[PDB]
């Protein structure tokens, strides 16, 4: 799997159910006009392949403003991390090293 | 009072002066989407009532990223403890036992 093929969240209950069902979760909150989000796509694809025990999903902040708001996202990309049924942390910006460190620690 | 009623820090002037004004202080740095933060709320309410000589306040790290940066907050929740008008230390994570021990030492 890759950035292009992962689930794109569209609904708040859907988001809440994913969090509950997944013992390791990464959510890429991005915007389509935002360049650093595009830059992070190849990095995310690599992390998706490298971490098969982590579920990676994505969310367009402009298409799903309720979900972005729930996670207080106003800078993009924001990577939201969940562990054992709850959200635990956030990595803000196109920081591939910080993102891998967070994912590795899940 | 309770987690819901305690002062919420919304600017740096307020943050700095309230520290200076209080001889025993707990700042709960939290995020609204953060599961461990939510978990700690009932614990904080019990600690607030058990330690009426200690001022508890709270700060939303997404709403007030400047204050969070001033305390170099990374993990959610982070409790920053103050004694005699200055900050002295942190308790990191949803650890009620460790938080209560720190408060008892104030």
From Swiss-Prot, chains A, B:
Keywords: Disulfide bond, Electron transport, Mitochondrion, Redox-active center, Transit peptide, Transport. The record marks 35-36 as: Contributes to redox potential value. Coiled coil: none annotated. Belongs to the thioredoxin family. One of its GO terms (cellular component) is mitochondrion. The chain holds residues 22 to 127 of 127 of the full protein. The record marks 28 as: Deprotonates C-terminal active site Cys. Residues 1-106 form the Thioredoxin domain. GO terms for biological process: cellular response to oxidative stress. Yeast has two cytoplasmic thioredoxins, TRX1 and TRX2, and one mitochondrial, TRX3. Present with 1010 molecules/cell in log phase SD medium. Signal peptide: none annotated. GO terms for molecular function: disulfide oxidoreductase activity. It is found in: Mitochondrion. Transmembrane segments: none annotated. This is Thioredoxin-3, mitochondrial. Disulfide bonds join 34-37. The active site is at residues 34, 37.
